[PDB]
Amino acid sequence: TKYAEGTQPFTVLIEGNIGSGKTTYLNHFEKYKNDICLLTEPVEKWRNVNGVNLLELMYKDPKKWAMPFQSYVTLTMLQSHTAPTNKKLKIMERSIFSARYCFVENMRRNGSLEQGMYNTLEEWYKFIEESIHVQADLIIYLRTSPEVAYERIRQRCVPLKYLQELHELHEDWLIHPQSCKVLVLDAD
Amino acid sequence: TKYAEGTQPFTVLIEGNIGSGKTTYLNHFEKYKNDICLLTEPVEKWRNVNGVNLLELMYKDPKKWAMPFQSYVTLTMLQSHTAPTNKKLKIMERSIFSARYCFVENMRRNGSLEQGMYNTLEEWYKFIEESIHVQADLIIYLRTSPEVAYERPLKYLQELHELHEDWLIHPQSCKVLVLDAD
Ligand SMILES: O=c1[nH]c(=O)n([C@H]2C[C@H](O)[C@@H](CO)O2)cc1/C=C/Br
Numbered sequence: 001t002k003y004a005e006g007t008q009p010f011t012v013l014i015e016g017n018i019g020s021g022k023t024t025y026l027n028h029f030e031k032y033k034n035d036i037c038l039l040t041e042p043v044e045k046w047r048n049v050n051g052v053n054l055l056e057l058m059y060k061d062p063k064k065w066a067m068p069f070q071s072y073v074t075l076t077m078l079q080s081h082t083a084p085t086n087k088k089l090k091i092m093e094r095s096i097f098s099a100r101y102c103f104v105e106n107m108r109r110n111g112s113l114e115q116g117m118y119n120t121l122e123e124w125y126k127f128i129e130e131s132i133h134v135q136a137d138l139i140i141y142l143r144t145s146p147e148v149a150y151e152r153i154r155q156r157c158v159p160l161k162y163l164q165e166l167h168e169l170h171e172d173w174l175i176h177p178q179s180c181k182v183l184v185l186d187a188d
Numbered sequence: 189t190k191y192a193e194g195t196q197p198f199t200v201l202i203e204g205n206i207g208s209g210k211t212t213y214l215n216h217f218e219k220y221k222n223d224i225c226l227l228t229e230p231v232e233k234w235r236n237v238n239g240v241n242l243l244e245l246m247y248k249d250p251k252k253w254a255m256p257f258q259s260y261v262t263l264t265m266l267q268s269h270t271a272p273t274n275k276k277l278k279i280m281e282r283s284i285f286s287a288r289y290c291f292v293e294n295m296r297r298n299g300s301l302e303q304g305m306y307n308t309l310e311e312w313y314k315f316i317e318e319s320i321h322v323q324a325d326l327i328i329y330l331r332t333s334p335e336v337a338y339e340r341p342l343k344y345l346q347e348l349h350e351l352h353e354d355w356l357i358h359p360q361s362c363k364v365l366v367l368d369a370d
């Protein structure tokens with residue numbers, strides 16, 4: 001009944017805080033490009049939505065641009081989640097769920113998304129799960145302490161408190177509404 | 189492949205400008221509630237999104253609220269478009285297409301939606317047509333002159349008129365029954 005039902009291989013979602021070595025960890029899979037569908041966080045797309053840089057505007061002016069940005073992330077995820085592929089295995093960096101449970105949720109808390117904006121996304125999330133098929137077999141959680149995450153970023157800029165909030169949300173979601181097995185890794 | 193594919197009866201879309209007697213014209217179908225799936229513009233829903241009145245905010249503060257409002261309209265329309273029904277015929281007041289081609293498009297022009305917000309909705313619109321099945325067999329266009337729609341800003345209604353015109357008289361293919369709603 002749902003879109004992209006039955007059309008998807010075994011799917012692994014790589015999840016974690018910002019600066020938890022997600023990009024590094026994925027490069028290790030990069031040499032099986034030919035047997036793995038390797039889909040990395042489409043930040044490229046969020047930085048150019050037909051010219052417009054949504055990611056910039058989001059940070060620059062959050063109360064205004066959070067809503068469209070998040071909506072756009074949710075889309076790009078779905079495109080990833082639903083892309084067709086001949087490959088026997090699919091690996092995504094993050095997913096619709098982390099967008100919904102970590103980022104949208106946090107932005108609600110620190111009032112980046114007002115009640116109206118948040119509720120629109122949530123009605124959309126609720127609709128999407130009714131309509132579109134999101135194949136998820138294993139999440140690999142690259143666990144870290146905020147402290148550590150913060151550094152990787154100081155190495156390569158968002159506040160430590162922010163990363164802490166994202167950490168708590170990732171923790172709530174993955175350690176303590178998503179059932180399918182969660183492989184916890186130590187990314188310290 | 190698409191969601192709600194194969195699950196929809198013959199579908200008629202009543203389209204027209206604001207104040208072109210759409211609501212009136214639908215009430216005439218209201219007495220076949222039992223054989224017709226009669227789905228009216230869900231303005232109720234846009235006025236209360238779990239407490240919040242999006243329609244208000246949109247008018248009150250356009251540059252800020254246009255984006256979520258439209259996004260929400262788009263959803264409510266999809267919910268209508270895709271709702272299940274045993275009935276042999278389905279009739280909707282407006283649709284996803286008039287949201288996209290008339291309202292979003294206008295708001296782009298008068299810069300209610302900036303380039304980044306517009307584009308997000310469009311990408312979404314593009315995605316939606318790939319993924320969700322929108323059954324549309326006949327559009328009934330209740331044509332009018334802005335003037336009249338008015339007597340029931342005028343420039344706004346004029347722009348909405350031009351867009352409705354471009355879309356329905358001069359990309360959506362499936363037969364268009366033009367009525368005169370003057
Ligand atoms: O919802 C989000 N909000 C958000 O701000 N980001 C930012 C964080 C980082 O700056 C950059 C790369 O992950 O994108 C990601 C997501 C979702 C990924 Br799913």
Ligand SMILES: O=c1[nH]c(=O)n([C@H]2C[C@H](O)[C@@H](CO)O2)cc1/C=C/Br
Nearest residue numbers: 206229231261282283286287291292
């Ligand atoms: O997309 C829309 N945007 C919009 O602003 N409206 C407004 C016009 C009027 O004030 C009121 C009655 O429909 O709602 C309708 C739609 C319907 C789209 Br389908």
